[PDB]
Amino acid sequence: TSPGLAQAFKALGIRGRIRFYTAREEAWARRLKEHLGTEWREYVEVLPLKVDFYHFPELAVALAYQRRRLQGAEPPQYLENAFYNLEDWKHIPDRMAYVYGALRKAGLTPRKGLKIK
Amino acid sequence: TSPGLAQAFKALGIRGRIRFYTAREEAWARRLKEHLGTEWREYVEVLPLKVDFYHFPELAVALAYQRRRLQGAEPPQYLENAFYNLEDWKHIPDRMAYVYGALRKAGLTPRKGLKIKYKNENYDISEEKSWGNLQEAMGGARELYSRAKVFSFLRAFHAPGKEANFLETIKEDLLGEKTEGEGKVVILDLPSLGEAADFFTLRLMDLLFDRAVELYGKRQANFLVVLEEAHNFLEDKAGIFYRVAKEGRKYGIGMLYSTQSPASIPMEILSQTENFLVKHLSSEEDVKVLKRAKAPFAFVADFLLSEPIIGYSYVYFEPYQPFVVPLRVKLLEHVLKSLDS
Amino acid sequence: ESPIGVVVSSRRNGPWAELTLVLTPQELDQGKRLLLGELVRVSSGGKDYVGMVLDGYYEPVGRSDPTYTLALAHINQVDLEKEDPWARKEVNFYHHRIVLLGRVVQGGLFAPSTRLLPPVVEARVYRMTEEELQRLLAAEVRTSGSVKAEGKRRYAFGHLAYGLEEGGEYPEVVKEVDPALFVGRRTANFGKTGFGKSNENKVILTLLAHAFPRVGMLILDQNAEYLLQTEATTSPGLAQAFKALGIRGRIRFYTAREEAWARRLKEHLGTEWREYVEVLPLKVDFYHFPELAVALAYQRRRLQGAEPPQYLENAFYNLEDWKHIPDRMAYVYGALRKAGLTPRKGLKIKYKNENYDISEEKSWGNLQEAMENNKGGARELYSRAKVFSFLRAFHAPGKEANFLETIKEDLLGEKTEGEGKVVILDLPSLGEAADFFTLRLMDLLFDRAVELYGKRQANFLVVLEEAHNFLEDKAGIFYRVAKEGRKYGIGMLYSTQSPASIPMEILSQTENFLVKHLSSEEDVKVLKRAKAPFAFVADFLLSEPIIGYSYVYFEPYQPFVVPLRVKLLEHVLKSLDS
């Protein structure tokens, strides 16, 4: 029953200082209401944890590489090469266009007007 | 003469909590009958460990692609391409016909009256004459048809007209919305899977872990994983089983692994295990690792080294146990005979 | 039946309890002595333990100056045997250190070590007789309050000994071993070269053959020392032992010098040896096994890595279909001939509808004309038939054997189930391809064994030599076998001569040990680390090069290590003959 940080801030009277990032906003909001009462919105703000892989394609490549070798082994040579030289490919517009096309084929909705060369 | 889980459950009077997945259900059912009477249907619910690959060509492709690869361990390019494009090919009847023909050429007997459309013509590969016509009549699937001899080993697991996917069945049994609580003891007869045991076990483990991660914030997984000879599966710091051992407490997933050699288990896992049940060890290195992981075992390392006694165990349940207690673990027979009072 | 000395101390040193013993002048003058490593009986408080002398040193007893006394006696030429009894008695003493290993409780059960430290006043040390020694050697660990198993028949292995010391041999004390210990369990046989390793291996194999007639053996004979007595000694080989035991039709010798080996077998066995040994060739005829030839050529690339050629790939995958098209089988045979393999005399090849005898030069030329004047990959194979050049070393016309398949049939044949054949491979006859063939055969045998799971167990034992060479690779087929053979009923018996090279996993998981003299410190250290009970004999192994002296230790229910003088194969054969 040790008080949490949000409850401590409630007791101290601090407001508008905690910004909670979660992927289960509904459940966390239910719990926050149950513990802090009706006016919990003053003390805590709940936000999502979603990112645009287009602006962070190294994250996408690393995530895919980690997902492989975790359901088996022997990641593809092409995947390893992309994982280790996407930094090089960053300055090659042709490879960048291929990567963006691969993402769109995967099926990620891109922001409007994202133009390749 | 030590009773098994089924006999213990019969003695305790618990019905409908066991599900035995085996590839020798005939013999296992005969043994269950002989050992449990004429009413063993109320305790053990045998299930098969075979599928019909014509419903799961993706599973067939994955199995072929994930073989041992002796010497040169380079996965076939055509197999990889099929593995990555079969979902798209499922919308092309021509390519699907190529894949079905590749399976049949491999030698997997299909259902009674399978239908194929090579160009625009109905083909019944269940019928030998239609199969011959299609074969004489015969993009991504042409390579698979040419190499269809690779799938020859899938006969040991094929079963026409199954449409089961014991993987999905087990996932539902352990984490289904309808089966919230009430438990389910899932016993896998891994040896009957031959050389596909590793593949199927890893696939099932990652499936269950992903489902549990999905369930976060709503309810806990609430099940236990019993692993035998864990030094084979916990060795790799990137494997799904290492991931489970390191991260399952957050999603309510336990573990119970027997190794017989603490030296092999990673120190990261060793330092983070709560319960211990140590029996005779005959390696100063094993005793050293045990002492390093847990300080209290320094008072019993010597007896562990020097005394090979059967049934004698030292138990230490963290975190609120003062010291290490030696015990003569009670026999399952006595436990059962006392649990009924 | 009386104490050998007086106990003057006791304590717990490390994990073991020790007590000091002192020999009085009267006993030292009666010839009573103790040899390091000897087994003695300790009686403390109505219970009997098992001791083992561990050390010996001289120390003054009471108030006396032995150095000055002895120097003064010497300078006056006083003979301290019949001239100064008081001087002799005041200084004649000697200390010994003993370690308790446990006690034999109930009906043969063994309780390791002890939790009670024995008081000095009530502790007595006795010498142990032959009957007590036998009953001690016949004991092993058991769960609790349980009667003994009363297992199968047992065969004598050796007799206890304490080195080359006179009076240190007990021929009537024989360690009896059940050969089932060697079935499905991996065994280690360490020791220098020429110190009885071959003798003990032959004895073990003979015991298995006589006891379990339903177990096969794959003997990778590197030294050609297991079939017949070498031209260096007189000890019989496996064939001679089997002849003496009257075991018929259980040997299958694969070699490449069949003529010489048959000559030797005749000269050593008589004329009826065909009833015992079947000599078979190690040379294949690729004109009968194009699938084998193509598989070898294709897998050579993969074993060297890199993507194999597409024509080789599709040929390897579709040769079975091509066998129904003579118009393509002609291409395959022509490719082999261009590669250079000599065909049998009278081979006929049917191209289109014509018959050619490629064994003749002019007919081969005409067939070349017809072929050169795209049926699958056959044309590509004929074009690049130079890839099959390397197979000329493995080729011999008129063989039709395919030993790689014959061995698998022999070892895992359902129609052959029962009375396992003793396959003996004469490796030195294969030159530089011996390792390649060994690895290929082992891999294809292990694959078949794993496939047959559930229907039947492999039930055969693998004999290995220079195991440090094959067990060094963690990804090797032999390492995989060492790790997982017991599951599929595949045993092992490897003699390394250098334990340090074998991985710690293999050393720890091994069940049996037969250690002979070791010369290096690293080997002894690794042995002690791998197994605790070998902590007492390290010094003896390091500094006692004795031929035929072995320290045996069989897991998992053996109390301690035993020094043995293994029996000779001749005497074992004579004993079994009765």
Next chain:
DNA sequence: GCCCTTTTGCAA
């Protein structure tokens, strides 16, 4: 040291 690349030349 080890592992990919580029090039030339000869099939087809």
Next chain:
DNA sequence: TTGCAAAAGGGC
């Protein structure tokens, strides 16, 4: 035009 062999320079 493509596929395959064989030699020599690059990256890590």
